[PDB]
Design a protein around this ligand. Structure first.
Ligand SMILES: Cc1cc(=O)[nH]c2ccc(Cl)cc12
Ligand SMILES: Cc1cc(=O)[nH]c2ccc(Cl)cc12
Ligand SMILES: Cc1cc(=O)[nH]c2ccc(Cl)cc12
Lengths: 238, 238, 238
């Protein structure tokens, strides 16, 4: 996160840090608790990931320093990538992790509500992007979970800023005209959380942008409300 | 209907009573006129129904006592159950009855409008559940069509009350925190009708709940607006 | 267009005139620029059209007199008709033209934004229908692009006026109770453009009506917002 500040412990209790153990253990991406066995994250996070066996999901974390060999985590039973996903910049950048065990909810770890199709008309005015990603394009993973308040930008405006792309209605953009606050490398898959009528909603999934926090380059997020049918379908037992 | 009152004749002119003739004739479920040849109702009503030949749809009824051997009814040509339906508590609790003959509309029998996808944002504040069902969990079918005004509850709130279920965006809930007013056995398949801008809309189909009218147990209804595409598809000739 | 007036040059810069060259060259239908290589229009326009080779799309036109043998145009590479289209009156009256070359945008030719699913709740109050069609049921193609401001009508109201049809949620209607302003023959496939929050949105595609501008006979338009998923799907490369 560029231009953000340190979070208060547990103020984003749906935020997880997804680690890979290969070759050695490191933070890979953000994600969001949306169900007792379910993390919603970005498909692009799994480039070159051939097995869920190398993944570990840590909940209730503020500082990466909390994570040691003796720290408890959730194993991943299954990675579900949207069947139309090819790459972040073409959309469908959404994935589910089915956990091996269930999350016991508490003040530090609880699920975020999905957006309602009826809130499509809502103007979200209190939106935050969070993560342990870079503070600049070439940097490193940050210890303390960072937050930045960023305004949503219309898809018409977003399209103006990305003339070489198609910004679709399945994407949502957020950024300041002058830049300065944005997601960056390592924030991928985490939430764009918007508080509306005293309820936090998972409006976006951190996906891509050209650089980080540049002027006239809004961050591009997966528009979660366009995938609530897909999420429902994929989270049913069979 | 628990905690309701007797309806005025024809104040719910889309409400039908669906009877089965097997083994002897009795009220089975409620339903709603949505087209000249079409009743919308709940899939769960047809458990163990092997043929539409045993079904009779009566329109323009206030009192069950109106129904005798010499009372006119509509035959059922086809029962269309949602292909994803398994049971009420897992959703997709929706079915269409294609009638053998067409309903001639009149003051006592006319169709209710389907909800618009653009009204998803609307806060419906004038919603009523109607039927000839039980006034308590163990009771019997009531003679006079009952009505009860019940407030909609958010899906977030509804999910809190049904921790052992998944309350999906294809469901909608209604109830008082303190209970006392609700649908019950025999009200299944009938409408949750909401009046907005002087027009009645078929917002829900009476589906299920834990008991009837209990504290902290909202009634769960099929969220009709999520099925307008399905209804359109299934009501086309071929 | 019945009851309309002459447009100002380029005030509808997304409006194209689609010509057929067979047997000799003539205006066939309207259409709208929605992308650099993409025109959105009505499926019914292509009755008896067996090849895209006979089609020419002219942008930046006010007067048909501008079009001569030496006037530049866009060739059509592909006609994409909705796979459920059968005829205008049954809906799915939507088609895409993929152009052979790309449109270079300018003040006289630029794309119109598609409606957002979140604007379904919006009451559009500034809507215009445009084209070179007839000024009365039996007439001829008009030289100067005509415009008429027409109010949207609810689908409930529209259905009342077309008792022999099914007016679906994939249609949108516009007209005056007393008639007098409407699309007519030759306006097919053009836009119903509505300006909301200083942005023009392509709300409808001119489709059909009983006669032109008759009392109690609103024009029926393809409800574009119901097809944004389809448009996205069909405009992707493969
Ligand atoms: C993931 C990522 C990497 C990057 O370099 N820039 C970005 C800018 C914006 C958003 Cl939303 C994400 C990214
Ligand atoms: C159908 C039914 C049976 C029952 O026992 N309880 C209910 C409670 C609420 C609603 Cl909406 C329906 C029912
Ligand atoms: C295309 C067309 C032909 C016609 O004769 N009447 C109409 C009336 C209304 C609308 Cl929207 C279109 C038409």
């Amino acid at each position: 996160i560029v231009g953000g500040t340190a979070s208060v412990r547990g103020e984003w209790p749906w935020q997880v840090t997804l680690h890979t153990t290969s070759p050695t253990q490191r933070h890979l991406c953000g994600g969001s608790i949306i169900g007792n066995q379910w993390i919603l994250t970005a498909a692009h996070c799994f480039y070159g990931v051939e097995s869920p066996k190398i993944l570990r999901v840590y909940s209730g974390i503020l500082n990466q320093a909390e994570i040691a060999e003796d720290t408890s985590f959730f194993g991943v039973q299954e990675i579900i990538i949207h069947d139309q996903y090819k790459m972040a910049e073409s959309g469908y950048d959404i994935a589910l992790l089915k956990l091996e065990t269930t999350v016991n909810y508490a003040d530090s770890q609880r699920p975020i509500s999905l957006p309602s199709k009826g809130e499509r008309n809502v103007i979200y005015t209190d939106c935050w992007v969070t993560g342990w990603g870079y503070r600049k394009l070439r940097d490193k993973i940050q210890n303390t979970l960072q937050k930045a308040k960023i305004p949503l930008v219309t898809n018409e405006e977003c399209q103006k800023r990305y003339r070489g792309h198609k910004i679709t209605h399945k994407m949502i953009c957020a950024g300041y005209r002058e830049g300065g606050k944005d997601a960056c490398k390592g924030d991928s898959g985490g939430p764009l959380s918007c508080k509306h009528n005293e309820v936090w909603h998972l409006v976006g999934i951190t996906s891509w942008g050209e650089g980080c926090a540049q002027r006239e380059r809004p961050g591009v997020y997966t528009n979660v409300v366009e995938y609530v049918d897909w999420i429902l379908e994929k989270t049913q037992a069979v």
